[PDB]
């Protein structure tokens, strides 16, 4: 479990394994005292970078838990279809309700 | 040249509002919303032409 | 020289093999220069060999500057004054700042002398006053030197740097001001640049910096407070090094 009061602990594997349901509570319940005896190898700006690939690649995880919910991703725009020689490539405005009971 | 002056003459912005020049400056329409008139002030005022 | 270094994979032909050196010398005899000279004043086998020829002169003058600035300013100095500018009564409190303002400038002058490109340094007054002196050890290029600079040692030639704000150069032209204890200033004879109208050290927000054919220069501050510097005791330019310098920078006058 990554300790949020030392920046020398955040990796992408430790945050992607954490769900986004639990990352709401872990940020507000930490220790206010920032510590500065162990810095980060990519800099402190690189520690924020390592945090956000940890959140962005975790968005597949929160979506795969809802894979019985939404529909197939329709091609939103033209140019995304195989057979082009008689009919065009449609683009489906995804204004619908993605929900499967 | 001696006075470094220049006289204006009978002029306005509408042929509509130029109509009130043929009665003298007694009731000459000076000013409608933007349409402006300057009556003749010159040695040539009141004369034959 | 390519294929004898390409088939041998010699990346730099000073790493060329000793038989592979002289067999090329048995073929083409004009290469004894770039292979068998102890210290050629032009660097052998480099692309920027003419550029590295220039950057040394940019370096070697700054040490001739930088160890001469320390020379006249060894300890606590007595500079008292050299020009004649009288004060109003509340004008002395401006120099109350100039006491406090002073030592940050002499870094940032030399920082700006570092900060210029050397290609942009050769248009300034000190880079041509040395050429008026290296021609005296020949008319230097662009004829910025007047007809009467070569007459006395009292004909100096200034540059102008900004005192406050940023320490920046405020000229295109070397402004040659003839200087007479005390001595009052006088211009020379004569497309419009702002600062070029004043005497050296005449007013605030101006640093004035003149040089000579004798190459004894001045650093003129506002208020007469100026002093000579013997940069001639610190210019160490070897003549066979300097003779490729001057010929590229002189002009044979008709």
């Amino acid at each position: 479990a990554p300790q949020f009061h030392r920046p020398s602990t955040i990796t992408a594997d430790n945050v992607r394994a954490l769900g986004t349901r639990g990352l709401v509570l872990a940020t507000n319940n930490a220790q206010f005292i920032m510590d500065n005896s162990y810095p980060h190898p990519h800099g402190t700006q690189g520690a924020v970078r390592e945090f956000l690939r940890g959140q962005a690649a975790a968005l597949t995880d929160l979506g795969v838990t809802h894979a019985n919910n939404t529909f197939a991703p329709q091609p939103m725009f033209a140019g995304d279809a195989a057979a082009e020689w008689l009919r065009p490539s449609f683009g489906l405005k995804r204004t619908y309700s993605p929900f499967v009971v | 040249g001696l006075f470094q002056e220049a006289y204006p003459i009978t002029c306005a912005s509408d042929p509509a509002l130029l109509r009130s020049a043929r009665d003298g400056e007694a009731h000459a329409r000076e000013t409608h919303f933007t349409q402006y008139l300057i009556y003749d002030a010159s040695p040539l005022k009141g004369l034959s032409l | 020289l390519t294929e004898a270094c390409a088939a041998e994979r010699v990346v730099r032909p000073h790493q060329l093999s000793p038989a592979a050196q002289t067999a090329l010398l048995r073929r083409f005899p004009a290469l004894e220069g770039p292979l068998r000279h102890p210290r050629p004043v032009l660097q052998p086998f480099d692309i920027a060999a003419e550029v590295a020829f220039v950057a040394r002169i940019q370096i070697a003058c700054l040490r001739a500057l930088g160890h001469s600035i320390r020379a006249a300013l060894q300890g606590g100095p007595r500079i008292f004054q050299r020009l004649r500018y009288d004060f109003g009564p509340h004008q002395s409190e401006w120099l109350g700042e100039v006491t406090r303002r002073f030592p940050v400038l002499l870094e940032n002058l030399m920082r700006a002398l570092e900060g210029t490109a050397p290609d942009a340094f050769f248009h300034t007054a000190y880079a041509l006053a040395v050429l008026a002196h290296l021609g005296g050890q020949l008319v230097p290029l662009s004829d910025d030197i007047p007809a009467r600079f070569a007459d006395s040692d009292a004909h100096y030639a200034f540059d102008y740097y900004s005192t406050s704000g940023d320490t920046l150069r405020l000229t295109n032209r070397p402004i040659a001001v003839v200087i007479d204890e005390q001595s009052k200033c006088r211009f020379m004879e004569g497309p419009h640049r702002v600062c070029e109208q004043y005497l050296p050290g005449e007013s605030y927000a101006y640093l004035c910096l003149g040089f000579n054919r004798r190459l004894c220069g001045l650093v003129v501050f506002p208020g007469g407070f100026a002093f000579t510097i013997n940069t001639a005791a610190y210019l160490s330019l070897a003549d066979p090094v300097a003779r490729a310098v001057g010929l590229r920078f002189c002009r044979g006058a008709a």
């Binding site: 970078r49 956000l52 690939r53 204004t95 | - | 920046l168």
Partner: protein
């Protein structure tokens, strides 16, 4: 009357043979004859361009402290907004009377000798009196062009042409000026960031947010982006009541209207110096000027590829541009300093683009219509930009409490009743985005899982302060105006902040968004005067005197100066007027 009982007529087409000679651009002796007997240090706030230094994130606190001194010194050259007409004509109260010489130019006390795209603090000392160039007719000061005269021209062009409905602007003006405005709407805009592919991903969010916020306020929702409003027109215009949908389609049709008012006043003539006829006529057609929010790279590919163009200097690292085709998680290096602008806006990220765009030629012109004109017609001075901490933004975009649904359970619909809904008080913890769906009431449901898979797709690093300069165009470019400059500052990955809300600690004051006034058109009277840690001494100079941080352009070295921007925060004439009026203020000279 002639020499008869005969009428005669003198037009202003009469004036063809006098005003059109190439001596209007002949001011060589003017700058020389005024130059002697110099002027002292006129504390050059608006009379100096700074090159950018460092990131944009701290650039205020540079310029706040750098001009902490010569800002409370005196006044700027303009005070004439307080001056009535003929108070300029009188000998007192205008020391700058002897400095107003040309109808096409300006003589003002600027810096002496320091070359302009460089340095931060100019050496206050002796001064110089040079030029800039008056670009469009609106730059004449407002004691010479009356304010009522600008509306006089505007209304009478208003006839014959399409106008906004009088009802629908009340929705927009309420929306633009809404204080309690749901801050997802600032965040979800930077989420799409103009990417069309991320838009048609997230169309249910776009559907419901406008649908929810309409019931709170009869107002549009997302409206500070032309691209975003343009996408709502096409890809969303089906699932709405017409009363809501009328607002956007009237908005574009009025931008359709204000677009083709240029070319009714044009003549067919040859192409010229690279520019077209329309580019030389009006300011909105010249591509060297580019809008303050540029998400793609169509602009500089048009702008820097011009014969007018000189050194678009992006200054955090390397000064000259080289660009990105696409951008993703590993490409949006959220805090960098190189100057690479992103092209990640089109529908087809698979058919990517670095050199060949996707958009029409009027696309940026439409943004130049929407940003430079319409937003000041609703601003009255109150709007300003924002520089984006996308690292802070992309933390909290993908930060939602959307629970798992039960096997056999229904769809989340309502927040207060349904416990499975993301906006339910059981699902409300602070510092998550469905709490930010809840801070302003925006009903957005359980199918919001479709967002994050594409939120992980495309992202953008951080904004940058792009400074493109240019020469006077073919048609004004004589041998005394060749050296002249027009500085045009704009941000790439930036968002407009309509309503400055700082009397509220919900977004703490400048967390996601450092303000960065990119221009006098967007200069926060309440944004900038209420910044992060802050001098109180400038409070006088904040209530007026638009604080333009001088990396982003100066008061005199741009296309749009102070005379028109007061005119924006002045006369109470209608929206239909000021749209045409400021447009009429944009006719080149």
């Amino acid at each position: 009357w002639g020499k008869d009982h005969q009428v005669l007529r003198l037009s202003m087409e009469n004036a063809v043979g006098t005003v059109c000679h190439p001596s209007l651009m002949n001011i060589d002796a003017a700058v020389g004859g005024v130059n002697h007997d110099p002027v002292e240090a006129a504390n050059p706030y608006g009379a100096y361009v700074a090159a950018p230094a460092g990131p944009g994130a701290d650039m205020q606190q540079r310029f706040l402290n750098a001009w902490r001194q010569r800002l409370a010194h005196g006044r700027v050259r303009w005070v004439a907004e307080c001056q009535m007409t003929a108070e300029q004509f009188m000998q007192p109260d205008n020391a700058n009377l002897a400095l107003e010489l040309h109808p096409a130019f300006d003589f003002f006390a600027g810096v002496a000798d320091v070359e302009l795209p460089g340095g931060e603090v100019p050496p206050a000392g002796p001064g110089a009196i040079q030029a800039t160039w008056r670009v469009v007719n609106g730059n004449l000061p407002l004691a010479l062009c009356p304010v009522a005269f600008r509306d006089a021209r505007g209304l009478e062009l208003g006839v014959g042409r399409h106008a906004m409905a009088p009802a629908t602007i009340a929705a927009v003006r309420g929306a633009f000026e809404d204080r309690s405005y749901p801050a997802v709407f600032y965040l979800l805009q930077a989420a799409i960031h103009g990417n069309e592919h991320v838009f048609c991903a997230l169309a249910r969010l776009v559907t419901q947010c406008i649908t929810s916020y309409w019931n709170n306020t009869r107002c549009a929702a997302f409206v500070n982006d032309y691209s975003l409003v343009s996408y709502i027109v096409t890809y969303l215009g089906g699932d709405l009541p017409e009363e809501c949908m009328a607002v956007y389609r009237d908005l574009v049709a009025h931008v359709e209207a204000l677009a083709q008012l240029v070319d009714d006043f044009t003549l067919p003539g040859p192409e010229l110096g690279g520019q077209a006829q329309a580019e030389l006529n009006h300011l909105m057609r010249d591509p060297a000027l580019l809008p303050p929010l540029v998400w793609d790279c169509d602009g500089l590919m048009r702008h820097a590829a011009l014969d007018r163009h000189r050194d678009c200097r992006i200054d955090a690292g390397g000064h000259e541009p080289v660009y990105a085709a696409a951008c993703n998680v590993a490409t949006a290096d959220f805090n960098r300093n190189d100057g690479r602008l992103l092209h990640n806006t089109q529908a087809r990220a698979a058919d990517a683009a670095d050199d060949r765009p996707h958009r029409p030629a009027d696309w940026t012109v439409h943004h130049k219509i929407y940003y430079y004109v319409l937003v000041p017609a609703f601003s009255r001075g109150r709007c300003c930009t924002a520089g984006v901490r996308f690292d802070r933004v992309y933390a909290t975009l993908q930060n939602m409490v959307v629970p798992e649904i039960a096997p056999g359970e229904e769809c989340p619909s309502d927040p207060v009743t349904d416990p499975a809904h993301p906006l339910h008080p059981a699902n409300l913890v602070a510092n998550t985005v469905k709490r930010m769906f809840h801070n302003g009431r925006v009903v957005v449901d359980g199918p919001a899982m479709l967002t994050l898979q594409v939120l992980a797709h495309n992202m953008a690093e951080r904004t940058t302060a792009l400074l493109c300069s240019a020469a006077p165009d073919a048609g004004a470019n004589t041998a005394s105006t060749a050296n002249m400059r027009i500085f045009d500052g704009a941000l790439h990955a930036g968002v407009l902040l309509m309503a400055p809300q700082h009397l509220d600690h919900t977004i703490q004051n400048g967390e996601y968004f450092y303000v960065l006034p990119v221009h006098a058109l967007f200069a926060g009277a309440d944004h900038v005067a209420n910044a992060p840690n802050f001098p109180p001494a400038l409070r006088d100079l904040a209530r007026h005197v638009p604080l333009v941080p001088p990396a982003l352009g100066a008061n005199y070295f741009s296309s749009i100066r102070q005379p028109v921007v007061q005119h924006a925060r002045e006369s109470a004439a209608g929206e239909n007027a000021l749209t045409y009026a400021l447009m009429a203020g944009y006719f080149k000279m």
